[PDB]
């Protein structure tokens, strides 16, 4: 089923792995690419957002088919065990998506820009890569210029936030990846990847091990889930863009076990709240700051949550990074895919509860600016509800034992092996990470595309 050897073997089919296929299909057109996705194809084109399916029954079929083989939202599935431990909080609602397109087939396409300490300091071309990620995701800030209540909510929030703030951190329209239709991985891959005769997407293909020959990346061990047969595809470069959890799992199962692998895991603590407008008859952005480490997004709700005039407020906190926030794998216990079972060690420090308390007070302050608060008390979601897990394969300047990959997202111990996703982000971020993670993927894919085009082999 699979080719015996390719140039680049891509694990996963989310937006970050698709960004590797995108830049390689743009900058390295002669390189043969093999993308292996454990989940099935649930949309047309492969990786499109499920909302492109107008039929709710067909759309529910696409969502439920992505939930793998305390409830998870449509298109995602939770862990069955190893999500909490005595003495720690863990992530009881740590969810995952197994389908072509990954979570980008079910996400809401909010692509804000990092600011302050969120921005990775040792990347001088960060803004350059962030604009490129805007190009691949189709990000636009003017998707709701004709909305009646978008401008009203935005100006009423600005009356309490924009005080003393520079324009980059004032209330502004949330940059959205819209293609009406939310942009999925089909947008990231685009015509350049689908029309690339050297690229091929293999769905229902589980990658069980990363092959290493003489220290460098050798290939991937791919199990054909249609038949159960395990193949071995050779590759000069291996990109693992599974997710924030299964990416360190695949490396752990491959014997690639650095000290920082999975450690420094950080979830974005999320607070929700609702409020009502005041007039009779889009998504707003409350940017992060260092002194207010919260990321706010306000948007219209179809109806009131409690028994477009009603808005839903969501604040996301930046985590106090801890090394003991490790992702642990057990070789003896296997999950439903035959890979090592996950042990999630997550505990909010006192600094976390201090910031979380401030987020509840600030979202109430924001709810009073929009109008009459529909709710009475802001609700804190369980850890892992934001689906924004970082640091598990984080980048660093050196291999001091605190990072897993280079600034080019290249794993230190395994040359030719690259990791993609939110886990690559090493900083304490609060905004939606997918845009930044795609920007890091463009730098890593350009590191491969330049090494291929410049090589003599
Ligand atoms: C309801 C919802 C709303 C969201 N809204 C937002 C938002 O507004 N903003 C934002 O920034 N983010 C949002 N997200 C999160 C966003 O979708 C993800 O952060 C994004 O998909 C990350 O990209 P990725 O490719 O690294 O991860 P993924 O898309 O999860 O990539 C992992 C892929 O690899 C596959 N895979 C895993 N293991 C293997 C293996 N062993 N072999 C082969 N393939 C494998 C998986 O099946 C999956 O397709 C939302 C998520 C959900 C569920
Ligand atoms: O699922 C939907 C959704 C489904 C519909 O049918 C529809 O019409 C509109 C919808 O809008 C949404 C808007 C959202 O903000 C969220 C999100 O909460 C998550 C954790 O809980 C965070 O990851 C995301 O950062 C945050 O963006 C959503 O999950 C959804």
Residue numbers in the entry: 5 to 73, 91 to 200, 207 to 308, 325 to 350, 360 to 509
Share the article's original sentences.
Glycoside 3-oxidases (G3Oxs) are recently identified bacterial flavo-oxidases from the glucose-methanol-coline (GMC) superfamily that catalyze the oxidation of C-glycosides with the concomitant reduction of O2 to H2O2. Here, we report that PsG3Ox oxidizes at 50,000-fold higher specificity (kcat/Km) the glucose moiety of mangiferin to 3-keto-mangiferin than free D-glucose to 2-keto-glucose. Analysis of PsG3Ox X-ray crystal structures and PsG3Ox in complex with glucose and mangiferin, combined with mutagenesis and molecular dynamics simulations, reveal distinctive features in the topology surrounding the active site that favor catalytically competent conformational states suitable for recognition, stabilization, and oxidation of the glucose moiety of mangiferin. The overall structure of PsG3Ox is composed of a flavin- and a substrate-binding domain, comparable to other POx structures.
The structures of complexes PsG3Ox-Glc and PsG3Ox-Mang are similar to the native structure with r.m.s.d. values of 0.40 Å and 0.42 Å. but display significantly (almost twofold) higher FAD cavity volumes. Furthermore, these structures show higher a.d.p.s values and lack visible electron density maps of residues close to the insertion-1 and substrate loop regions. The d-Glc and Mang were refined with substoichiometric occupancies (∼0.8) to have similar atomic displacement parameters (a.d.p.s) with neighboring atoms, 57–63 Å2 vs. 56–70 Å2 and 85–117 Å2 vs. 67–95 Å2, respectively. The weak electron density in the aglycone moiety of Mang suggests that this region is more flexible, presenting higher a.d.p.s values than the glucose moiety, 108–117 Å2 vs. 85–96 Å2. In the PsG3Ox-Mang crystal complex (and dockings), more hydrogen bonds were observed, which may explain the higher affinity and catalytic efficiency of PsG3Ox for this substrate compared with d-Glc. Notably, in both experimental and computational dockings, a clear preference for the positioning of Mang oriented towards the C3 oxidation was observed in contrast to the C2 positioning of d-Glc. In contrast, an open conformation is mandatory for the binding of Mang.
